[PDB]
Design a protein around this ligand. Structure first.
Ligand SMILES: Cc1ccc2nc(-c3ccc(/N=N/c4c(S(=O)(=O)O)cc5cc(S(=O)(=O)O)ccc5c4O)cc3)sc2c1
Ligand SMILES: Cc1ccc2nc(-c3ccc(/N=N/c4c(S(=O)(=O)O)cc5cc(S(=O)(=O)O)ccc5c4O)cc3)sc2c1
Ligand SMILES: Cc1ccc2nc(-c3ccc(/N=N/c4c(S(=O)(=O)O)cc5cc(S(=O)(=O)O)ccc5c4O)cc3)sc2c1
Lengths: 58, 58, 58, 58, 58, 58
């Protein structure tokens, strides 16, 4: 059968992350910052028409 | 049968996270900040028409 | 049969989290902050029309 | 049969959380803060029309 | 048969929580705060019309 | 048969909670606070019309 998929994504994976760390630090005067401004505008149109039709003589 | 999917996402996975850490620190004067401004506008139109039709002579 | 799905999400998973930690710290003068402003506007229209139709001669 | 699903979510999972921790700390003068402002506006319209129709000659 | 679902959620799971902790601390002068302002406006319209119809000649 | 579901939720699960803790602390001069302001406005309209109809010639 018919399958239709529309994706509009903002994905952030593994950002400023640690995994399997075995480190030694003494002083950390500073960190990390994430700043996101999410202002999209969506005026899209999705249309689907299914069905048989006969005679047209406008 | 017909399947229709529409996704509009904001995903943040594993951001400023630790996993399997075995570290030694002495001083941490500073951290991390997450700042998100989520102001979208949605004026989208979704239309579906199903059904047979006969004769049209407008 | 017909299946229709619409998703509009804001997901935050594993943000500033720890897992399986075995660390030693002495001083932590600072933490993490999450600031979210969620102000969306939704004017979307969803329409579905099902059913057979006969003759049209407007 | 027909299935229709609409989701508008704000999900926060595993934020500033610990799991399986075996750590040693001495001083923690600072914590974490979560600040959420949830002010959405919803003017969406959902319409469904089902049923057969005959003749139209307006 | 017809199934229709509409979800508008604010979910906070596992926020500033601990699980399986075996840690040793000496001094904790500071905690965590959760501040939520939930002011949505809902003017949505949901309409469903079912039933066969005959002839229209307005 | 027809099934219709509408959910508008504010859920807070496992917030500032402990589970399976085996920790040793000496001094805790500070705790956690939850502050929620729940002021929504609902002007939504839900309408359902079922039943067959005949002839219309306004
Ligand atoms: C009852 C209760 C109440 C409150 C509470 N808070 C908890 C908690 C646990 C772990 C936390 N980790 N926070 C961080 C942060 S930060 O966002 O906090 O600065 C930044 C990082 C940057 C890098 S890297 O870029 O150098 O790779 C690597 C690892 C990081 C990290 O691990 C923060 C808070 S447990 C708990 C239990
Ligand atoms: C390059 C550089 C230069 C300077 C520098 N200083 C550092 C540093 C690190 C940790 C410090 N903790 N200082 C203190 C102090 S106090 O001595 O500071 O007043 C008093 C306390 C009273 C109680 S209790 O009686 O209420 O039970 C419990 C805990 C306490 C504590 O933990 C003080 C200084 S790192 C560094 C790195
Ligand atoms: C790029 C960028 C830059 C800056 C930025 N700032 C952000 C932000 C987000 C949320 C904020 N909430 N601030 C507050 C404040 S306040 O003191 O801080 O005004 C007081 C409150 C008192 C009570 S109660 O006692 O009456 O129960 C309940 C809730 C409260 C609250 O929620 C404040 C700031 S996001 C961002 C993104």
């Amino acid at each position: 059968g018919k399958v239709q998929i529309i994706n509009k994504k903002l994905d952030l994976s593994n950002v400023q992350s640690k995994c399997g760390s075995k480190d030694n630090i003494k002083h950390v005067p500073g960190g990390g910052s994430v700043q996101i401004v999410y202002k999209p505008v969506d005026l899209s149109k999705v249309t689907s028409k299914c069905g048989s039709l006969g005679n047209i003589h406008h």
